[PDB]
Scaffold this motif. Structure first.
Motif, mmCIF file in Angstrom:
data_model
loop_
_atom_site.group_PDB
_atom_site.id
_atom_site.type_symbol
_atom_site.label_atom_id
_atom_site.label_comp_id
_atom_site.label_asym_id
_atom_site.label_seq_id
_atom_site.Cartn_x
_atom_site.Cartn_y
_atom_site.Cartn_z
ATOM 1 N N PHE A 1 0.870 -1.175 0.000
ATOM 2 C CA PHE A 1 0.000 0.000 0.000
ATOM 3 C C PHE A 1 0.913 1.234 0.000
ATOM 4 C CE2 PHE A 1 -3.214 -2.512 2.996
ATOM 5 C CZ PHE A 1 -3.293 -3.541 2.048
ATOM 6 N N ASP A 2 0.750 2.116 -0.975
ATOM 7 C CA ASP A 2 1.711 3.235 -1.150
ATOM 8 C C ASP A 2 1.487 4.267 -0.066
ATOM 9 O OD1 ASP A 2 2.567 2.138 -3.706
ATOM 10 O OD2 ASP A 2 0.771 3.080 -4.554
ATOM 11 N N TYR A 3 2.561 4.637 0.631
ATOM 12 C CA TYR A 3 2.520 5.735 1.608
ATOM 13 C C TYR A 3 1.224 5.734 2.404
ATOM 14 C CZ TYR A 3 6.427 6.838 -1.397
ATOM 15 O OH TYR A 3 7.604 6.761 -2.115
ATOM 16 N N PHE A 4 0.916 4.545 2.909
ATOM 17 C CA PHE A 4 -0.402 4.177 3.385
ATOM 18 C C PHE A 4 -1.030 5.145 4.376
ATOM 19 C CE2 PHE A 4 -3.161 1.255 6.158
ATOM 20 C CZ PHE A 4 -4.246 1.269 5.266
ATOM 21 N N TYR A 5 -0.291 5.565 5.407
ATOM 22 C CA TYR A 5 -0.895 6.468 6.415
ATOM 23 C C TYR A 5 -1.249 7.830 5.826
ATOM 24 C CZ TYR A 5 1.136 3.167 9.912
ATOM 25 O OH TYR A 5 1.505 2.069 10.632
ATOM 26 N N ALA A 6 -0.393 8.337 4.931
ATOM 27 C CA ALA A 6 -0.633 9.602 4.243
ATOM 28 C C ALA A 6 -1.854 9.524 3.326
ATOM 29 C CB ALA A 6 0.615 10.031 3.451
ATOM 30 N N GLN A 7 -1.958 8.453 2.530
ATOM 31 C CA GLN A 7 -3.160 8.228 1.701
ATOM 32 C C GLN A 7 -4.424 8.162 2.542
ATOM 33 O OE1 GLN A 7 -1.891 4.865 -1.255
ATOM 34 N NE2 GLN A 7 -3.417 6.229 -2.211
ATOM 35 N N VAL A 8 -4.386 7.429 3.654
ATOM 36 C CA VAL A 8 -5.542 7.390 4.558
ATOM 37 C C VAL A 8 -5.903 8.773 5.118
ATOM 38 C CG1 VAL A 8 -6.661 6.412 6.588
ATOM 39 C CG2 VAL A 8 -5.397 4.921 5.051
ATOM 40 N N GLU A 9 -4.926 9.539 5.598
ATOM 41 C CA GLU A 9 -5.229 10.908 6.046
ATOM 42 C C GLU A 9 -5.882 11.797 4.958
ATOM 43 O OE1 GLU A 9 -5.610 11.921 8.936
ATOM 44 O OE2 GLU A 9 -4.424 10.579 10.176
ATOM 45 N N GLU A 10 -5.483 11.617 3.700
ATOM 46 C CA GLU A 10 -6.035 12.385 2.581
ATOM 47 C C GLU A 10 -7.434 11.931 2.211
ATOM 48 O OE1 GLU A 10 -3.320 11.956 -0.678
ATOM 49 O OE2 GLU A 10 -2.007 13.539 0.081
ATOM 50 N N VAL A 11 -7.673 10.623 2.282
ATOM 51 C CA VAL A 11 -9.015 10.089 2.021
ATOM 52 C C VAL A 11 -9.972 10.581 3.107
ATOM 53 C CG1 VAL A 11 -10.462 8.009 1.880
ATOM 54 C CG2 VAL A 11 -8.269 8.074 0.714
ATOM 55 N N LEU A 12 -9.495 10.573 4.344
ATOM 56 C CA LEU A 12 -10.304 10.982 5.481
ATOM 57 C C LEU A 12 -10.515 12.497 5.610
ATOM 58 C CD1 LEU A 12 -9.466 8.313 8.178
ATOM 59 C CD2 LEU A 12 -11.428 8.512 6.644
ATOM 60 N N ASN A 13 -9.549 13.273 5.128
ATOM 61 C CA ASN A 13 -9.600 14.729 5.150
ATOM 62 C C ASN A 13 -9.308 15.265 3.751
ATOM 63 O OD1 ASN A 13 -7.933 13.583 7.686
ATOM 64 N ND2 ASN A 13 -9.201 15.278 8.426
ATOM 65 N N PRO A 14 -10.316 15.265 2.861
ATOM 66 C CA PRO A 14 -10.136 15.636 1.444
ATOM 67 C C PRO A 14 -9.492 17.006 1.185
ATOM 68 C CG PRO A 14 -12.293 14.640 1.797
ATOM 69 C CD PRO A 14 -11.714 14.885 3.155
ATOM 70 N N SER A 15 -9.665 17.954 2.110
ATOM 71 C CA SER A 15 -9.104 19.305 1.960
ATOM 72 C C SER A 15 -7.575 19.340 2.109
ATOM 73 C CB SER A 15 -9.760 20.278 2.945
ATOM 74 O OG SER A 15 -9.592 19.807 4.270
ATOM 75 N N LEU A 16 -6.998 18.245 2.606
ATOM 76 C CA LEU A 16 -5.552 18.089 2.695
ATOM 77 C C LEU A 16 -4.903 17.707 1.366
ATOM 78 C CD1 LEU A 16 -4.900 16.148 5.994
ATOM 79 C CD2 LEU A 16 -4.796 18.607 5.675
ATOM 80 N N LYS A 17 -5.686 17.155 0.437
ATOM 81 C CA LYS A 17 -5.157 16.760 -0.872
ATOM 82 C C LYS A 17 -4.581 17.975 -1.584
ATOM 83 C CE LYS A 17 -9.109 15.094 -2.066
ATOM 84 N NZ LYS A 17 -10.086 15.090 -3.194
ATOM 85 N N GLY A 18 -3.398 17.800 -2.170
ATOM 86 C CA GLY A 18 -2.706 18.888 -2.845
ATOM 87 C C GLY A 18 -1.762 19.687 -1.953
ATOM 88 N N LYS A 19 -1.815 19.434 -0.643
ATOM 89 C CA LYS A 19 -0.983 20.110 0.365
ATOM 90 C C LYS A 19 0.055 19.131 0.943
ATOM 91 C CE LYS A 19 -4.490 23.401 2.317
ATOM 92 N NZ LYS A 19 -5.821 23.087 1.673
ATOM 93 N N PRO A 20 1.224 19.631 1.407
ATOM 94 C CA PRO A 20 2.152 18.698 2.050
ATOM 95 C C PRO A 20 1.604 18.214 3.382
ATOM 96 C CG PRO A 20 3.214 20.779 1.510
ATOM 97 C CD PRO A 20 1.751 21.005 1.411
ATOM 98 N N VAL A 21 1.584 16.895 3.555
ATOM 99 C CA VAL A 21 1.075 16.249 4.768
ATOM 100 C C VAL A 21 2.167 15.331 5.315
ATOM 101 C CG1 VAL A 21 -0.633 14.601 5.717
ATOM 102 C CG2 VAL A 21 -1.359 16.370 4.076
ATOM 103 N N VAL A 22 2.453 15.452 6.601
ATOM 104 C CA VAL A 22 3.481 14.632 7.220
ATOM 105 C C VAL A 22 2.855 13.974 8.444
ATOM 106 C CG1 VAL A 22 5.810 14.635 8.275
ATOM 107 C CG2 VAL A 22 5.332 16.151 6.325
ATOM 108 N N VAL A 23 2.768 12.647 8.405
ATOM 109 C CA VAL A 23 2.300 11.847 9.550
ATOM 110 C C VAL A 23 3.504 11.500 10.441
ATOM 111 C CG1 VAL A 23 0.987 9.820 10.284
ATOM 112 C CG2 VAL A 23 0.431 10.915 8.111
ATOM 113 N N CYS A 24 3.393 11.843 11.724
ATOM 114 C CA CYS A 24 4.481 11.724 12.694
ATOM 115 C C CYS A 24 4.260 10.589 13.708
ATOM 116 C CB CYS A 24 4.649 13.051 13.456
ATOM 117 S SG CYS A 24 4.732 14.580 12.450
#
Length: 336
Positions: free
Chosen positions: A8-31
């Motif tokens: 699963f590609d960059y799985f946690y980041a993809q999940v955060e983007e699916v769950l919060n659509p307004s984050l798509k297109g922005k840099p997202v870093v899961v810590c």
């Protein structure tokens, strides 16, 4: 045997983007908790953030990314639905981790062309249902299917046919083989064992003396093109090894090296399971067991394991009078 690996590609980041659509297109870093980068999304990676780095370093590279804490429970929910999707393609599934699964599809397809189309259909199915892209690697065994995925990721699909397996055995360096690190590669380099095929020029007993029994057997079966480990999920409450010594002993110094061989094999077998508990297991000369363990507030590094293991074996030597015949370790209580 035809194995299909799903990453699963960059799985946690993809999940955060699916769950919060307004984050798509922005840099997202899961810590992970600072604190390190668990995963960086497409934009964060583009602007220079990589997994594994300190968050403090991530913020120096890309000060204004969206920094999110890990929500592993949520990611696990998504993961489990995707693994469920995957069982309807084959019942022979091995859930390797939260974002990795192998399928034996030998009975589902006729050749690598058919394997490929099925990989395409799995990608389409997961994207449709979970809004998540995956990489598919396909080959004759789990190891080459995983190498396939690593050649194709992200959002890719790759087949390594039988002929390409043989070229790869000749051309792959030791460090390229899944599960084998640079320390191991560097020792082997010292012998002029450079390529995977070069492991066939060395006596087995000599190879295992330098790199351990498990790694030796692994590399040799791969180089022989004989690796055929079944695809099933296991199911480990504990990972350990017990080694029979040449002689009965009560000598801490004579005993240490076999203990270490036990720890080294155990750690290779851990993968990236992180144990919180360790037990030293001594098989006495009369074939009873004496054992002593500790449960740490923190995951046990391989260093913490050496130190502790000597302490536990020392306790055994003190609170029991018998000679020791076999000696080993068990690691347990894995996060998460």
């Amino acid at each position: 045997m035809i194995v299909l690996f799903v990453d699963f590609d960059y799985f946690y980041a993809q999940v955060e983007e699916v769950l919060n659509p307004s984050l798509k297109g922005k840099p997202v870093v899961v810590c992970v908790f600072s604190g390190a980068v668990a995963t960086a999304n497409y934009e964060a990676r583009k602007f220079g953030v990589k997994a594994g780095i300190p968050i403090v370093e991530a913020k120096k590279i890309l000060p204004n990314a969206v920094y999110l804490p890990m929500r592993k429970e949520v990611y696990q929910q998504v993961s489990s639905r995707i693994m469920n999707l995957l069982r309807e393609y084959s019942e022979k599934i091995e859930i390797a981790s939260i974002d990795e699964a192998y399928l034996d599809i030998s009975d589902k397809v006729r050749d690598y062309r058919e394997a490929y189309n099925l990989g395409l259909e799995i990608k389409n199915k997961i994207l449709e249902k979970e809004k998540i892209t995956v990489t598919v690697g396909i080959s004759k065994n789990k190891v080459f299917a995983k190498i396939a995925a690593d050649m194709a990721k992200p959002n890719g699909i790759k087949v390594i046919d039988d002929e390409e397996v043989k070229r790869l055995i000749r051309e792959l360096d030791i460090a390229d083989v899944p599960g084998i690190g640079n320390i191991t590669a560097e020792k082997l380099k010292k012998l002029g064992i450079n390529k995977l095929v070069d492991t066939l020029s060395i006596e087995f007993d000599k190879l295992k003396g330098m790199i351990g029994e498990a790694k030796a057997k692994y590399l040799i079966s791969l180089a022989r093109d004989e690796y055929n480990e079944p695809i099933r999920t296991r199911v480990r409450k504990s990972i350990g090894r017990i080694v029979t010594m040449k002689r009965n002993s009560r000598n801490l110094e004579e005993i240490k090296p076999y203990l270490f061989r036990a720890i080294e094999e155990s750690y290779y077998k851990l993968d990236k399971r992180i144990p919180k508990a360790i037990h030293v297991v001594a098989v006495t000369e009369d074939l009873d067991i004496v054992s002593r363990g500790r449960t740490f507030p923190h995951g046990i590094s391989k260093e913490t394991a050496y130190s502790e293991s000597v302490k536990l074996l020392q306790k055994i030597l003190e609170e029991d009078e018998r000679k020791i015949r076999r000696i080993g370790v068990r690691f347990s209580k894995f996060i998460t």
